[PDB]
Amino acid sequence: DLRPLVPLDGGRFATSDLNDLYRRVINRNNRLKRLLDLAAPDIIVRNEK
């Protein structure tokens, strides 16, 4: 509730910046998780790191 989500008047949802930043870091953390349990090549896993 400190990075809140109230939409616009026409139903379109306008967020804060922090939800986008957290979405980016969580998605890339999930992809790094998939590549670590996949045991990817070291160049690929260091690029995702």
């Binding site: 509730d1 809140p4 989500l5 109230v6 939409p7």
Partner: protein
């Protein structure tokens, strides 16, 4: 006692009046954004009760202020019954805790007495009002 169609008429009228005067307090349930949009998309058991256009509410508040100045306890129990939604079992226990069956008996007979006092003055206050007519055009 009183006839039952007059009884349900006063039940509906003071229910609407208590629903009107319950939408004015400050310590009230303020919703978030997400609960508001969940309520606007798919409601559950969150429905409300009808109120007035506040002039009818004004005149009935004026008649209960005029006649119910001499009794504090009946005014308090009709407020706490009509605004919050507490049962007579609940307000009987709430008044006995600070017997209980005779307490339930005295709160229902003071409710019956206050309704018997408020009904005919309410009928006269209803019939002696001019309905404001709709808007007209002169040429």
């Amino acid at each position: 006692n009183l006839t039952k169609e007059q009884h349900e008429w006063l039940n509906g009228w003071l229910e609407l009046w208590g629903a009107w005067v319950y939408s004015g307090r400050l310590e009230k349930r303020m919703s978030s954004v997400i609960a508001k949009f969940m309520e606007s998309v798919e409601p559950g058991r969150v429905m409300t009760r009808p109120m007035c256009n506040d002039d009818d509410g004004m005149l009935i508040s004026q008649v209960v202020d005029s006649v119910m100045y001499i009794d504090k306890k009946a005014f308090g129990i009709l407020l706490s019954y009509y605004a919050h939604g507490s049962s007579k079992h609940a307000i009987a226990s709430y008044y006995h805790r600070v017997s209980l069956a005779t307490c339930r008996r005295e709160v229902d007979e003071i409710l019956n007495a206050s309704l018997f006092m408020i009904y005919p003055v309410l009928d006269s206050a209803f019939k002696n009002r001019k309905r404001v007519e709709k808007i007209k055009h002169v040429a």
